Amino acid sequence: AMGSGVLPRPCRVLVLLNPRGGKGKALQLFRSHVQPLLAEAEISFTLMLTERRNHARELVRSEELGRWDALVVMSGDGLMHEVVNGLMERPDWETAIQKPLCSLPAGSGNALAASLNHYAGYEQVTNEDLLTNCTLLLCRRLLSPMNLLSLHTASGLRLFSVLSLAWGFIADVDLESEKYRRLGEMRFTLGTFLRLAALRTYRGRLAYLPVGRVGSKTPASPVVVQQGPVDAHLVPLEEPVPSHWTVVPDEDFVLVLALLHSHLGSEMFAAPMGRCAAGVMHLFYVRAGVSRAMLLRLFLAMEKGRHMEYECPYLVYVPVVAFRLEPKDGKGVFAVDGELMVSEAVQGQVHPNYFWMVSG
Ligand SMILES: CCCCCCCCCCCCC/C=C/[C@@H](O)[C@@H](N)CO
Structure with a gap:
């Protein structure tokens, strides 16, 4: 399964992170397991913290998307759900839904991440190993439509x-x-x-x-x-x-x-x-x-x-x-x-x- 596109190198991404994920350790995990990889890959980032109900959805609905090469979502399937729905709720949804997205897993409920890890040909892993593998895919920058x-x-x-x-x-x-x-x-x-x-x-x-x-x-x-x-x-x-x-x-x-x-x-x-x-x-x-x-x-x-x-x-x-x-x-x-x-x-x-x- 080959890529149908690529992020530019270097690039910058918005990281929407739920600090409650991974039993309240998501930010720590980002710092230890994600950040150092992003640096070597020349991926610049900004961390925005989102925990409340429809907050990530509202943020994505109003975001100036042209300042980002991708949105990385670090929490779980639920947060991806919010981000995609946010994008589709916009008046410019037809172009906004084309902004590349990335799922980095924290805690449980990471079916999407596990799917992507499988599609890349990695072994079925969990926790930190899954997070590392999904960060590696981000660092390799290949894209596929979903x-x-x-x-x-x-x-x-x-x-x-x-x-x-x-x-x-x-x-x-x-x-x-x-x-x-x-x-x-x-x-x-x-x-x-x-x-x-x-x-x-x-x-x-x-x-x-x-x-x-x-x-x-x-x-x-x-x-x-x-x-x-x-x-x-x-x-x-x-x-x-x-x-x-x-x-x-x-x-x-x-x-x-x-x-x-x-x-x-x-x-x-x-x-x-x-x-x-x-x-x-x-x-x-x-x-x-x-x-x-x-x-x-x-x-x-x-x-x-x-x-x-x-x-x-x-x-x-x-x-x-x-x-x-x-x-x-x-x-x-x-x-x-x-x-x-x-x-x-x-x-x-x-x-x-x-x-x-x-x-x-
Ligand atoms: C499809 C084969 C059927 C074989 C029978 C066994 C079924 C038991 C499976 C229970 C697992 C439920 C947990 C996942 C729920 C989903 O809503 C996820 N999206 C949440 O992460």
């Missing part, structure tokens, strides 16, 4: 996702996990085991548009969007999905996962079938009926990306460009790039190669 997920909720909120949308088991493991950050990446194992022992299924309606079913025509009247891009594949949540979509017959699920990248976490190689093409994401779902033992084995095999070798009949994988998910029985709880989100229904479509990341 897909972007546009999401619509039943309340009419339109938002963007850089990594994932999860519902059911996976989202519940996030809720259970948060109270064990102290354990680092072990917290997902704990959360998973707990939820496995108390396994439940979720009622809902899933439809999607697989890649090979995309034609030359889109729906006559798609969803109305305040600011572009237009989600041409999507029709309003009040209308049925177009007839060329697949509507899953099964309405009972253990989980649904839309995933743009290889990794769900630094020790979770969820999508080993290869890097998504431009405008495509991974869709997984698990149908009710799997045993707790088989789910356990799928989870344990995920670390090495071997879970698909089981050929579990309850696990379905399809490459898609769009999906719709409607939980039955009131609102469902979703995780979007690791963050909680509750809604009666969500749908989304992938936009091809919309932003640029430093990567190997």
Whole structure:
């Protein structure tokens, strides 16, 4: 996987850092593991600290982007989510979203970083090693375009996702996990085991548009969007999905996962079938009926990306460009790039190669 662009040498970057990350050690880690590499690479930087809710989002929304060669985001997937949404909320979003971005991991919730490390051909590492590897990619300066997920909720909120949308088991493991950050990446194992022992299924309606079913025509009247891009594949949540979509017959699920990248976490190689093409994401779902033992084995095999070798009949994988998910029985709880989100229904479509990341 070759680069499709490069940062100039020398260059200067804005570092948005959350000082609470890495158990309050992010700034220390920047000084010890990032700064010295940046110096040898002739990367000049400015540190801006962002910890409060929508602060990084607001900062990026108002920034004079022409003074920077890239924005480096040092915290986790959540902060990247904010930065990308900030960029897309601007009136000049079509040029702003083209400013290269870089993810440097601090603490847990670094799926994006873990994905990029994997794509560069590094071993699956965590903590300091991951941070060093991701800094090395920044120092090598190569860029690659990345897909972007546009999401619509039943309340009419339109938002963007850089990594994932999860519902059911996976989202519940996030809720259970948060109270064990102290354990680092072990917290997902704990959360998973707990939820496995108390396994439940979720009622809902899933439809999607697989890649090979995309034609030359889109729906006559798609969803109305305040600011572009237009989600041409999507029709309003009040209308049925177009007839060329697949509507899953099964309405009972253990989980649904839309995933743009290889990794769900630094020790979770969820999508080993290869890097998504431009405008495509991974869709997984698990149908009710799997045993707790088989789910356990799928989870344990995920670390090495071997879970698909089981050929579990309850696990379905399809490459898609769009999906719709409607939980039955009131609102469902979703995780979007690791963050909680509750809604009666969500749908989304992938936009091809919309932003640029430093990567190997
Ligand atoms: C896809 C293969 C399915 C095999 C079954 C096993 C599933 C258990 C996986 C639980 C891990 C949940 C933690 C990650 C949550 C995500 O929202 C991240 N974006 C947060 O960092």
